[PDB]
Design a protein around this ligand. Structure first.
Ligand SMILES: Cc1ccc2c(C[C@H](N)C(=O)NC3CCN(Cc4c[nH]c5ccc(Cl)cc45)CC3)c[nH]c2c1
Ligand SMILES: Nc1nc2c(ncn2[C@@H]2O[C@H](COP(=O)(O)OP(=O)(O)NP(=O)(O)O)[C@@H](O)[C@H]2O)c(=O)[nH]1
Ligand SMILES: [Mg+2]
Ligand code: NA
Lengths: 469, 167, 166
């Protein structure tokens, strides 16, 4: 038979499942909705582990339970009463013999120890992967240290001592590869000559590599705390989503820099060389699976100032037209081909973050926080699972590092790029459009000629890498 | 066969803009949504007795990717310019969205509707007369919508399709 | 994209977590933090086919020994890990092999025998002895180092191939 449980009057987590407290989706069960007590019971269930559920819950729970209350509830879950001696035990004791305690031993082995260990696993994941709760609430951290540091008894001892050390390490807080990275490539600008660095003087291969390292680092720094609750759209977004916003602002700045490089090159022949060079950078982005970089270029080519430069794009070689067209087609039909390509490539990659943001926001806005059933309000957990499926996908692509060497000077050049200067956005984008009208006027105005601005060779070194001994 | 209309929703972030398309496309009578599902943004409708397909682009949440707006806007034949009736700044942003649409489409006469969205019970700060006057100065319709009751949602999209049809 | 459920099992301290984190993050963990249960995902192209690995990293400490049926039911394939400088961990392999066979009620479960910590000079389990055991199970034997990455991809991706052909 099943183990008997403590009375639900002394231990709240022994109440029977009913549709008034938990609803399952239609081989472990999947929870659609439940009370917080039932969610925590299943989070730490005696019959099975659910590591996905632990991540989902710890990522999303603040939309229905405060951190202080979560800690109180899992401490309550941990403190399980042991059953009293059975009739057979009583009779042994009355005869001066040692009882067999079969039911007590089974309940310890099959209920208490698994539930308690799974509570500790929640604590461990909470500290390791969601430590911001404790950074933001020092008293919460004190309570967790006190709880862990006072767990008695030898069955939990290895994990209690470990979690204590992990907490202390987190309070005061290296990559190996299957090969060597390729050699850094140089073109007109030579190492150390940062004053000459520019779109056409750096090697296009190395531009794409160093931007990919920068954009990968920016992608990898975004934590789920910046996403859940749609906080990057709200009034406190600079406080709650700083790494996400830094990543987006880099993308925007590079797109505008590409546009500015194009329209400030007034000579037609030189501007063709600029656009051709940016398409070569796009080709290397594609080879590196840097989809953020691919779309940075595509967005620049489709901007109002650049898109209308028919005389420029007429001279672009047919093969480069095809590269740009294929990249543009990634975004068509609501990113259909992009989504398929991302799911087929071999990482490392840099995803485009914008699709994730729209899907998290619409999932939050389009589903209710609670489901009403039999007069009760149940937490709508399916909605939180959908959000955590998106944050889980994001995290999966954050794991794999690029095997490329940093060039500190080129990295600094792109970190300090500031195409808008001190200008506001409208003033700057109006400037770019007015430059576009100057260099290729609207028909029927004649096309003017403009003097060259570059004193160095415009011929590209190409984007196939070289390898000396 | 039937005509497909490519509609684009534009407007300030953080003030409930996404509720418009969600409430339209939704199972009208079950409050649920998975935006990741292939064609959670396509809907076959009958407008003035003529069946058509709406393809709605709503990039809500991507507002900080400001240099992508041109690319997204160029996909559209008609535009819903959305502000929140309790956020004056989102209303003041409308002029620049409209100017940007005209530039991207290279036309002074782009089908569009002005939508005032009631996203919560916070106090209204943009009166309907202010928004009607702005819409009239542009020569476009004005529709008010509720983000909670679905009121006005069909009217906003169907009015835009009629603007496209009568362009 | 085909999804594969991999489970890493073996005695405490043999390097199951270090092997998994080296595969996932290209990083070697120096600390010994005993696992309760952890799970990881990895998209990777193997033999020209993209798939999604779900990797369950399990508890080796004996205090968790009564909680294994639940993860053995879900796993498709198992990395059975011992450390080549720990003879007791090698003797513990057969207990994991037998439990997996019982729970899945099958003599034909995809498995790979993994001898970890092969970067260390002071070996106590000879390759021949582990290879003999692997042959008796009908499975390959791969020596690994979570520290240097030697053998790590080979071990996990060999297990994927055995699930794929199962
Ligand atoms: C890559 C390409 C493809 C086709 C062409 C053509 C022929 C084509 N039937 C055409 O008349 N395209 C008109 C609009 C597009 N514009 C080029 C362009 C500017 N920014 C972009 C962003 C993304 C894409 Cl995909 C294209 C562009 C040229 C004029 C001439 N040049 C081409 C270059
Ligand atoms: N030299 C060397 N040390 C290793 C290797 N793999 C793991 N270790 C070390 O061995 C210790 C235990 O590693 P760990 O991965 O935690 O083992 P585990 O099998 O996951 N333990 P548990 O079953 O308790 O979760 C750590 O100190 C780790 O750095 C290896 O290949 N070489
Ligand atoms: Mg471990
Ligand atoms: Na206001």
């Amino acid at each position: 038979g099943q183990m008997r449980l403590p009375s639900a009057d002394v231990y709240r987590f022994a109440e029977p499942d009913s549709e008034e407290n938990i609803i399952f989706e239609e081989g472990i069960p999947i929870i659609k909705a439940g009370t917080v007590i039932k969610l925590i019971e299943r989070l730490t269930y005696h019959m099975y582990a659910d590591p996905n559920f632990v991540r989902t819950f710890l990522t999303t729970y603040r939309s229905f339970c405060k951190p202080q209350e979560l800690l109180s509830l899992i401490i309550e879950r941990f403190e399980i009463p042991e059953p009293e001696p059975t009739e057979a035990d009583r009779i042994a004791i009355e005869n001066g013999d040692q009882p067999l305690s079969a039911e007590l031993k089974r309940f310890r082995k099959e209920y208490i120890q698994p539930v308690q260990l799974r509570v500790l696993n929640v604590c461990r994941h909470w500290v390791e992967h969601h430590f911001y709760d404790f950074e933001r609430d020092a008293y919460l951290l004190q309570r967790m240290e006190e709880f862990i540091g006072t767990v008695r008894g030898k069955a939990m001892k290895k994990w209690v001592e470990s979690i204590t050390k992990i907490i202390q390490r987190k309070k005061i807080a290296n990559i190996t590869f299957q090969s060597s990275p390729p050699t850094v490539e140089w073109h007109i600008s030579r190492p150390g000559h940062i004053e000459t660095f520019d779109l056409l003087t750096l090697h296009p291969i190395e531009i794409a590599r160093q931007l990919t390292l920068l954009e990968s680092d920016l992608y990898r720094a975004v934590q789920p705390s910046e996403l859940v609750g749609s906080v990057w759209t709200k009034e406190d977004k600079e406080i709650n989503s700083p790494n996400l916003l830094k990543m987006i602002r880099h993308t925007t700045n590079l797109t505008l820099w590409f546009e500015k490089c194009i329209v400030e090159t007034e000579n037609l022949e030189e501007r063709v060389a600029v656009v051709s060079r940016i398409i070569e950078i796009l080709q290397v982005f594609q080879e590196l699976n840097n989809f953020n970089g691919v779309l940075e270029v595509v967005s620049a080519m489709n901007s109002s100032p650049v898109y209308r430069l028919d005389h420029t794009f007429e001279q672009i070689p047919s093969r480069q037209k095809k590269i740009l067209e294929e990249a543009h087609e990634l975004s068509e039909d609501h990113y259909k081909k992009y989504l398929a390509k991302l799911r087929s490539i071999n990482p490392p990659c840099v995803p485009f973050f914008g699709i994730y943001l729209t899907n998290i926001l619409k999932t939050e806005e389009g589903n209710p926080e609670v489901l009403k059933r039999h007069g009760k309000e149940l937490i709508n957990f399916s909605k939180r699972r959908k959000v955590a499926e998106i944050t889980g996908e994001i995290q999966q692509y954050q794991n794999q590092p690029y095997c490329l060497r940093v060039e500190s000077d080129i990295k600094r050049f792109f970190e300090n790029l500031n195409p808008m200067g001190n200008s506001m956005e409208k003033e700057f984008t109006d400037y770019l459009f007015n430059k576009s009208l100057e260099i290729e006027p609207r028909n029927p105005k004649p096309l003017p000629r403009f003097p060259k601005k570059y004193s160095y060779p415009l011929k590209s070194p190409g984007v196939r890498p070289s390898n000396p001994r | 066969g039937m005509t497909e209309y490519k509609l684009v929703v534009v407007g300030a972030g953080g003030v409930g803009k996404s509720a418009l398309t969600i409430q339209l496309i939704q199972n009208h009578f079950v409050d649920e949504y998975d935006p990741t599902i292939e064609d959670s943004y396509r809907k076959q409708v009958v407008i003035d007795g003529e069946t058509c397909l709406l393809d709605i682009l709503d990039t809500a949440g991507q507002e900080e990717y400001s240099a992508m707006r041109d690319q997204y806007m160029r996909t559209g034949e008609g535009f819903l310019c959305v502000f929140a009736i309790n956020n004056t700044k989102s209303f003041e942003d409308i002029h620049q969205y409209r100017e940007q649409i005209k530039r991207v489409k290279d036309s002074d006469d782009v089908p569009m509707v002005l939508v005032g969205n009631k996203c919560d019970l916070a106090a209204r700060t943009v009166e309907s007369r202010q928004a009607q006057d702005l819409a009239r100065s542009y020569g476009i319709p004005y529709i008010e919508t509720s983000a909670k009751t679905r009121q006005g949602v069909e009217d906003a999209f169907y009015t835009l399709v009629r603007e496209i049809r009568q362009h």
